[PDB]
Write a protein that holds these residues in place. Sequence first.
Motif, PDB file in Angstrom:
ATOM      1  N   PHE A 147      47.264  37.708  41.163  1.00 57.45           N
ATOM      2  CA  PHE A 147      47.639  37.348  42.512  1.00 57.45           C
ATOM      3  C   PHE A 147      48.544  38.417  43.143  1.00 57.45           C
ATOM      4  N   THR A 148      49.574  38.839  42.424  1.00 60.43           N
ATOM      5  CA  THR A 148      50.467  39.849  42.933  1.00 60.43           C
ATOM      6  C   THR A 148      49.752  41.191  42.998  1.00 60.43           C
ATOM      7  N   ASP A 149      49.106  41.604  41.909  1.00 60.26           N
ATOM      8  CA  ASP A 149      48.339  42.859  41.878  1.00 60.26           C
ATOM      9  C   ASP A 149      46.903  42.441  41.496  1.00 60.26           C
ATOM     10  N   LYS A 150      46.064  42.152  42.503  1.00 60.20           N
ATOM     11  CA  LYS A 150      44.681  41.689  42.319  1.00 60.20           C
ATOM     12  C   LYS A 150      43.616  42.680  41.842  1.00 60.20           C
ATOM     13  N   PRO A 151      42.920  42.268  40.751  1.00 63.81           N
ATOM     14  CA  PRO A 151      41.766  43.008  40.183  1.00 63.81           C
ATOM     15  C   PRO A 151      40.607  43.193  41.089  1.00 63.81           C
ATOM     16  N   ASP A 152      39.515  43.112  40.405  1.00 61.49           N
ATOM     17  CA  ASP A 152      38.186  43.132  40.897  1.00 61.49           C
ATOM     18  C   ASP A 152      37.566  41.924  40.191  1.00 61.49           C
ATOM     19  N   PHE A 153      37.721  41.926  38.872  1.00 65.92           N
ATOM     20  CA  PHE A 153      37.206  40.844  38.054  1.00 65.92           C
ATOM     21  C   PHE A 153      38.107  40.611  36.856  1.00 65.92           C
TER      22      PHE A 153
END
Lengths: 268, 268, 476, 522
Positions: free
Chosen positions: D434-440
């Motif tokens: 949430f704070t540093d969002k991925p891709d998957f």
Amino acid sequence: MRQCAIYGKGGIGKSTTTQNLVAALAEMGKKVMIVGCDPKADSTRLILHSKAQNTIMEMAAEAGTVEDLELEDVLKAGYGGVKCVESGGPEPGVGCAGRGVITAINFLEEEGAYEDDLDFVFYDVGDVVCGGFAMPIRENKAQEIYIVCSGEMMAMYAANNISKGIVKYANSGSVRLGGLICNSRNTDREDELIIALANKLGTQMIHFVPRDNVVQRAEIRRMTVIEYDPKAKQADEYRALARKVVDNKLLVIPNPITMDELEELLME
Amino acid sequence: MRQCAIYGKGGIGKSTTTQNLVAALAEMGKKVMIVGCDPKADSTRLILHSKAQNTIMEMAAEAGTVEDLELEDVLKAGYGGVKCVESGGPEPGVGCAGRGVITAINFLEEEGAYEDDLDFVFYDVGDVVCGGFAMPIRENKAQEIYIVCSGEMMAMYAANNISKGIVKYANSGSVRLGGLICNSRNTDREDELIIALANKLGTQMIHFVPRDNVVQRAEIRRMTVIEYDPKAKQADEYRALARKVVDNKLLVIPNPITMDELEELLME
Amino acid sequence: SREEVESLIQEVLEVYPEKARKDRNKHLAVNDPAVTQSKKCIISNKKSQPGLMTIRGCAYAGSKGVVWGPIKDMIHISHGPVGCGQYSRAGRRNYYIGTTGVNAFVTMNFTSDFQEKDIVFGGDKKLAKLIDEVETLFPLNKGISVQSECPIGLIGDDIESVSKVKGAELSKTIVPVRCEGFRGVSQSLGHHIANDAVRDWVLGKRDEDTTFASTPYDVAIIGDYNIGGDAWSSRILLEEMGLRCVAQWSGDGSISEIELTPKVKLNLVHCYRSMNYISRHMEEKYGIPWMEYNFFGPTKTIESLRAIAAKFDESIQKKCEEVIAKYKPEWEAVVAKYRPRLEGKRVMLYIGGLRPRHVIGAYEDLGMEVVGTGYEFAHNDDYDRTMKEMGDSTLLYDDVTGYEFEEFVKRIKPDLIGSGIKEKFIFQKMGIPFREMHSWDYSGPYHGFDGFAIFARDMDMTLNNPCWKKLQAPWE
Amino acid sequence: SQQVDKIKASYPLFLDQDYKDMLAKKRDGFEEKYPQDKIDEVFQWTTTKEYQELNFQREALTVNPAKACQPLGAVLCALGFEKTMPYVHGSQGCVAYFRSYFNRHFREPVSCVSDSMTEDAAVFGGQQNMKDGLQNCKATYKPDMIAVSTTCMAEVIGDDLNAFINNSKKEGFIPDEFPVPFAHTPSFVGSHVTGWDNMFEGIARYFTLKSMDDKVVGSNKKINIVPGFETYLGNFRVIKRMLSEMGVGYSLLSDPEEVLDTPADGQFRMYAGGTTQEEMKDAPNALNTVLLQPWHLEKTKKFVEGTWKHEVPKLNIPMGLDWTDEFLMKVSEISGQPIPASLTKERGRLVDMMTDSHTWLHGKRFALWGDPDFVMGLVKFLLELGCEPVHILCHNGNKRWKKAVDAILAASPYGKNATVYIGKDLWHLRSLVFTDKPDFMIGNSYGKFIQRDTLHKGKEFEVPLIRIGFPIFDRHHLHRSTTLGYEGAMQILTTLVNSILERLDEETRGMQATDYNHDLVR
Ligand SMILES: Nc1ncnc2c1ncn2[C@@H]1O[C@H](COP(=O)(O)OP(=O)(O)OP(=O)(O)O)[C@@H](O)[C@H]1O
Ligand SMILES: Nc1ncnc2c1ncn2[C@@H]1O[C@H](COP(=O)(O)OP(=O)(O)OP(=O)(O)O)[C@@H](O)[C@H]1O
Ligand code: CFM
Ligand code: CLF
Ligand code: SF4
Ligand SMILES: [Ca+2]
Ligand SMILES: [Mg+2]
Ligand SMILES: [Mg+2]
């Protein structure tokens, strides 16, 4: 390298009897270790010199997990190059000390504490209340067991009760009762009394130990009687217990007696 | 109905001192019960007249589950209409007695063993080794605790070690230390040494108990001193202990002493 | 097939060493449609024999698994090591509404994750810091149920006290629920421990609070864990019959909803094995009559729809009939569609403490005669309800073991079988159609009218599916 | 309501307006539920950076693990040895869970038994059940071997499994020669992977310790293969295939493959395949032992190197490209056989797929978790493909491990933007995405909820979950694929490139809106 486990009814004389025996053993130029399998944490206090040092369980609490601990942190050198360690444990009314004993012995075994050329490894086990306190007498732990007793009705009920639980680990395993060690009722009809029980059990009474207050002079002065007063009467007594043990080859499987035969003894 | 637990160091005098105290409490025409929170299973043997009857945990094993037991099977009337129950327990080196203490206590409470007409419920607790052995002093168990002790360095270390583990259940709960009970260990300053420690602790020395051999006579004969020799010197002593207990109003929160102030005492 | 089961049973038991031999021989007996006690016919609720492949659970499965787990606005803490918690996360299919993580916490798993030292030094101290972290990290939590595990039972920690302190401190209800695995012979105790656990810490707190209005119709669905929606599939009928469904115990339950059960006019119980205990305290302390009902299939639900009606005024009764008339065409439609395919196909069951007898009626309607059943944690008073629902010379089991069950299946040779996940495979391999009954095999609601529809269709897609004919390869 | 020819199940049914009504009345009526406003609020809160620090400052509560207890990892080890019986000393519900769990993943039968230790057991220890249980089980399900395990219940009460076993022997319940290995499996210690070590090593001893005197290092000229806690049968099979097509002698110590995949042909098989005792017995006579996942087989190595005197190779889990050539090369160093032209082709075929798929996979930021060997493996291969392994969580990992992984990340530039996490549970990773969002995300079915929670925030914030690992309950038959070596690497790759391609097709399929980038070919 033999490892012997010392048992008895709390308050009859395990730790003194032990620390003094190894103190004597140390005197004989032997590589010994005293694993303290008792929550009290006094199993080494007389050879290391103090209340007690940093114990295994107490220490492993600091690192978060026991696997984080290092044999260097708990294992300490004391009198006559005798190595010491404590199993640690909780406080009255909380936790499972029977666990520490396990965690502690596993750790020692695990960290290769039985690694250096030791000649004797003494487990000073407290009360044999549950499964964990039997730890010292499995396979790979202690083979010789020296139950401590006295001339009291209840001190023998125990010596008897103890050897009884040993027959389970003794049959299935290799651990055996090497003999009883008596810390007397002054010698007033006891010198021979215990010998009676030692036979009905099928073991011997390795040695008889006196009620010498030199033990209190040492105890309260934070040391053993062998370092404290080298030539005192009971200093040789403890040297005897040490010598007999060393040469002792009588290791049997305990034969418990019944309350009826037990009380029958004292009765006579 | 008051409930008192009796603690101490194995080998100083809990059971006899307890059974005699309730023996005396019975003499006084009181409805009393003895809950044997010890694996040895001798907390009642002197009031009931034998090795030991069928315990809770031993009995319940027969019925497959503890829920299958009936209070009628464990609770047996003894001397002076005194009720007696045993918690049961494994043998040396196997199982968990600290659990029996629990299973046995929950049972008595569950089966309404208290919703009776008693005035005094005495808990004879053995070694305070772990958590379950702390059962007799939660909320709804015992409010008065009478630590037994003697003039020995290691007997006090426990009286002190015990009250320490008490402050935990004392602060958060209502349990309190009522006073120390000195059962003779033959020192010279048995009268004052204890009283001293009783003060540094913040409690009182409820009573002093002689080293009379009428108790081996009673012990080996399968009975209390009160039923054995009703007028024997120590028969009134135990009556004293009982009486003082009844009238005792002093229940404080201990205040342990340190090794250093401890040994300072004896050294004095 | 009269003396058969006996030549079948003691032949199956034949393998059992004499200790276990005598024992098991009493857990499985032939069912006589007329005896009203099983103390002469069969035994149940005793200890399970070692090393035998039981499906029975523990007291934990009953308290954190079946009873507490389901309360959606509370946070049930798995107190003890790590395994349990992470083995039941979303295992049970008791559905609910809400925002998981924010408002609800059911498909979630909170554990004190006991470590080596926690066990040694015991840990209430860890339990308090942990009851703290929830209040801070999960504000909308409306209470905390601390489900204990084996270790807590032995180490003897006062999880009872802490819950009083933290909670009396945080001004929130905490249920010191004791569900130690080593306790009881099965999961059963967990229920009884749960029930009571409720009456102690949750139930009696709205006692001198009358800002509520008891309507002559107010009721609560007790014992419908809403597996798949069954609770909703039933809460719909009652309400369409005019009754006012006030509470639902475990199954989209609200902690408050549980707290309003005492002010209802009637307690409707579907699970006589889980909430039977509480439903009595429910009546002796508060004085609120309760009854047993069954919503499996047309004839059961239809019937029951009337029983719960008579406990009220005629007003609701005529209204009830309207409901029965409404679904009459629908369920009739189902039978006329499926029964043709399930007709005569026999079925063999093995469940927990209610469905074993409670599903037969749902079957009678489809024409699938039941030739065998069993429970894994029921008592005689649970079999007392069974004998009647059964035919004569039908085989029944109690805590049946792999060998015990597998041999019956191998000999009786059923067209369809219904049990759990541990068993779903062993028979699918014997080419015997298996349909999960516990989890409804991730299918839709079975209780009530809408439910019966899916059921009648789920037995068909599995029993008559093409797979089965393809088991033995041609060349063989 | 339900209409016969179009039966609506669990999800369509409660959607009907009739049911929605109901639920609303329940909600507004007896739930005393908070108003969506603050619900949305509290949610909005948890999804923040403020909540995260609070989250991580956590030190007593755990939310949604990424580990299991030890007994579970023991049972799987046992399943591996031919005709053995996972035997668990303790409670019966434990095995009831151990089983149910292994079912949902493999979805085949899972046999395991238990001495049902009732209340009395805790109080008096557990001797009879061990005694009888060994007899009953051995009598009913007829094993050749029974490897004893233990639930929390025996650990605390410290039942000596060893003694308990031997009494039963002497007491005459089971043939004294009947193989019955054992290992204390403290569920409250380490993790499931740990159980596998204790359980394995236990057996590695039962058949060797006593017989050490007559075995020669490399007497059969074969190579031992210790898998460890592995749940992808495709991996057992693939490792056997390679060695086998190399003409390399080997012995897979602990081999579930047949047993966890018994054909449904009408005959139930409680046992199949497995490692023979006579095989485990002869183990020491091999040239050397290989440990596919050293990070949870640390106690095995101690034994193998110590008792068998094997010069155990310093290899990592055979994952991705480099760690596989290294695995094969070393096997080539030992067996004597060369790397077959066959395997070399395979490799090149993998590098082909990389060059061919490199564009889509380049730069994709991922968040992942699993066991210590898996994650260390996966992460690695992710750098090879050129993806940023942003958040790497391993709930049962340790310090020596963490810092070995960091270093593997220090090497490539695609790894300089990633952090490691040990002793941190899933609920922590919910924050990190949430704070540093991925891709998957690349994990188990449990990561199905972190996915959901990201969507509730915003479709443009949703983090799709790629299922690699264990468990995997919401999907079918994935247990048959491979994640080890070239073969299992062909898959990992396809599974992502196509995992990405799919999303791009969903993000872009809005008519006259985003469908312009709906390229027919990619
Ligand atoms: N030879 C002796 N004569 C008289 N008293 C002795 C003798 N040796 C030791 N003691 C006394 O025995 C008491 C207990 O001794 P020790 O510390 O050995 O206890 P223990 O019962 O073995 O302890 P634990 O059971 O807790 O391990 C001390 O007060 C000590 O002074
Ligand atoms: N002052 C005394 N009065 C009576 N008996 C005594 C005294 N001092 C020692 N004894 C004897 O010592 C033994 C200890 O008594 P008791 O049976 O109470 O044991 P205990 O060690 O206190 O029991 P436990 O430790 O199991 O609680 C008995 O044999 C007892 O008669
Ligand atoms: S096996 Fe119900 S007494 Fe209990 S989880 Fe299923 S037959 Fe349970 S109806 Fe129920 S909702 Fe269940 S299906 Fe009584 S609650 S311990 Mo496994
Ligand atoms: S009866 Fe300890 S972690 Fe928990 S699964 Fe166990 S080995 Fe593993 Fe029931 S309450 Fe729980 S599942 Fe007691 S312990 Fe089993
Ligand atoms: S009696 Fe023993 S096994 Fe039980 S809790 Fe106490 S120290 Fe632990
Ligand atoms: Ca399958
Ligand atoms: Mg000592
Ligand atoms: Mg006593």
